[PDB]
Amino acid sequence: EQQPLTLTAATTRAQELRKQLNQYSHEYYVKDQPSVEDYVYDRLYKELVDIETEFPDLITPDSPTQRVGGKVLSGFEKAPHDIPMYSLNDGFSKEDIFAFDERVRKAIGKPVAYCCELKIDGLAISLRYENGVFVRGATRGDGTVGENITENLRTVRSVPMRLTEPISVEVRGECYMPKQSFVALNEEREENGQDIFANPRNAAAGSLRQLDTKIVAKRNLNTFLYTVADFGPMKAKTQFEALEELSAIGFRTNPERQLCQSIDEVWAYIEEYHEKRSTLPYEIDGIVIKVNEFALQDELGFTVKAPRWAIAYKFPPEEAET
Ligand SMILES: NC(=O)c1ccc[n+]([C@@H]2O[C@H](COP(=O)(O)O)[C@@H](O)[C@H]2O)c1
Ligand SMILES: NC(=O)c1cnc(N)c2cc(Br)sc12
Ligand code: NA
Ligand code: NA
């Protein structure tokens, strides 16, 4: 009648199971290419649950079992941003974008390649990892102080609990509610006699600011990550490389990015994705254009208000394109 696992055996097995389950979840949710059928995942997940039940000391805050929600907070602690979450200067016309390029070429003294990305219209987030483990999730707030929504973000399945390497990094991006989920949610709320959300951004914000993680877990949220606060522990020397590296270590990144060699190529990208906007399952409010080379970003630096190496081209509001 003796239990099969010792504490040390249970500890090692739990570690193995967590690594495997984190991999499978990444494949299933982020790659959208699961290597195993659901029954395989479910089987290993149950084994972990049973270990954690028998040995509660082995439960880690980042374990796959901590994803499902249930915890309820009394309030959100403030979440300072030691490195500010800056906002970009905006452009609205072809003139604004070509003028930006002219200013960049003036400062650098040669043509400059640009990493072009979609500007995801959701809730800006910062994800802190310590030795490869998710330890803090925060909203942007005013860019200097946000809200600690760590537990809520654990329920968002695209957020990795562990990275492929044990690095410490502060990763920034957006969390959003897909358009199809938003419309469904609003109908559910209508039927419940609840106030509807004005748009998917408010719906994502409402969801991430719920104190009851069980409620948050029921909502459909996703993420795209595109930068870090400090590239010190990263190998990347360009923004395009940085996106590849973030994807490699386990973050969901947006696949529509393109490296452009001239501002004329940047313009074509802007035109391309204005047309593609309606076909995407997530909202965008424009296009972000960044000098690709980190060396050149460093040279350009920031003004008091924003980077001198990037601009956001703003499309008309989503509401103006039905
Ligand atoms: N096939 C897989 O690798 C895989 C990974 C994660 C979740 N799932 C499925 O998603 C559902 C929920 O699982 P989780 O709450 O652990 O994310 C279950 O039906 C599970 O089978 C499947
Ligand atoms: N891909 C990007 O750079 C990007 C996407 N979506 C956003 N809301 C933002 C905001 C800043 Br600041 S950058 C950025
Ligand atoms: Na969810
Ligand atoms: Na369209």
Whole-angstrom Cα distance, residue 90 to residue 137?
A: 27
Please tell me the distance between residue 180's alpha carbon and the centre of ligand 4 in angstroms: 17
Nearest of 226, 223, 55 to residue 153 by alpha carbon: 223
- Structure-block tokens of residue 84: 């500010």
Q: Residue 66: how many CB atoms within 10 A of its CB?
A: 19
Resolution (A): 1.6
Cα Rg of the chain (Å, integer): 21
* Residue to mutate, 22, 24, 26, 28, ligand 1, most ligand atoms under 8 Å from C-beta: 28
Measure the CA–CA gap between 259 and 292, rounded to whole angstroms. 8
Q: What DSSP string runs through 176-197?
A: E--HHHHHHHHHHHHHTTPPPP
Domains 1-67 and 123-252 share a fold: no
> Annotation-wise, does 89 bind a ligand?
yes
Give the CATH number of domain 123-252: 3.30.470.30
Residue 39 sits at the vertex; the CA angle it makes with 38 and 43, to the nearest 5 degrees, is 120
Assess contact for 149 and 80: CB atoms under 8 A: no
CA separation for the pair 181, 267 (Å, rounded): 32
Ligand nearest to the CA of 284: 2
Correct CATH for 1-67 of 1.10.10.10, 1.10.287.610, 1.20.1260.10, 2.60.40.1120: 1.10.287.610
Nearest to 210 by CA among 157, 125, 149, 154: 149
Please name the helix (run of DSSP H) or strand (run of DSSP E) that holds residue 90, with its range, or none.
strand 90-91
Ligand lying nearest the CA atom of residue 278: 4
Closest Cα to atom 3 of ligand 2: 288
Element housing 123 (H / E): strand 123-130
- For residues 69 and 52, is the Cβ–Cβ distance under 8 A? no
Residue 274 C-alpha to ligand 1 middle, in angstroms? 35
| Closest ligand 2 atom to Cα of 120 | 6
* Experimental method, per PDB record: X-ray
Q: Are 78 and 292 in contact (CB under 8 A)?
A: no
Rounded CA-CA distance 162/230 in Å is 19
- CA 146 to CA 142: how far, in whole Å? 7
Active site residue 218: no
Residues with CB under 6 A from ligand 2: 86-88, 117, 119-120, 124, 174, 226, 288
User: Positive or negative CA dihedral for 33, 39, 41, 42?
Assistant: positive
| Fold adopted by 87-121+253-322 | Dna Ligase; domain 1 (3.30.1490)
Catalytic residue among 31, 119, 214, 276: 119
In 186-223, which positions are buried (b, 16+ CB within 10 angstroms) versus exposed (e)?
beeeeeeeeeebebbbebbbbbbebeebeebbebbbbb
Rounded to whole angstroms, the Cα distance separating 304 from 152 reads 33
Which tokens hold the place of 177?
A: 């509610």
Which positions ≥6 away from 285 have C-beta within 8 Å? 119, 121, 314, 315, 317, 318
Tell me phi and psi for residue 98, to 5 degrees. -70, -35
Q: Return the domain boundaries, the chain.
A: 1-67, 87-121+253-322, 123-252
Q: Please count the residues of the chain.
A: 322
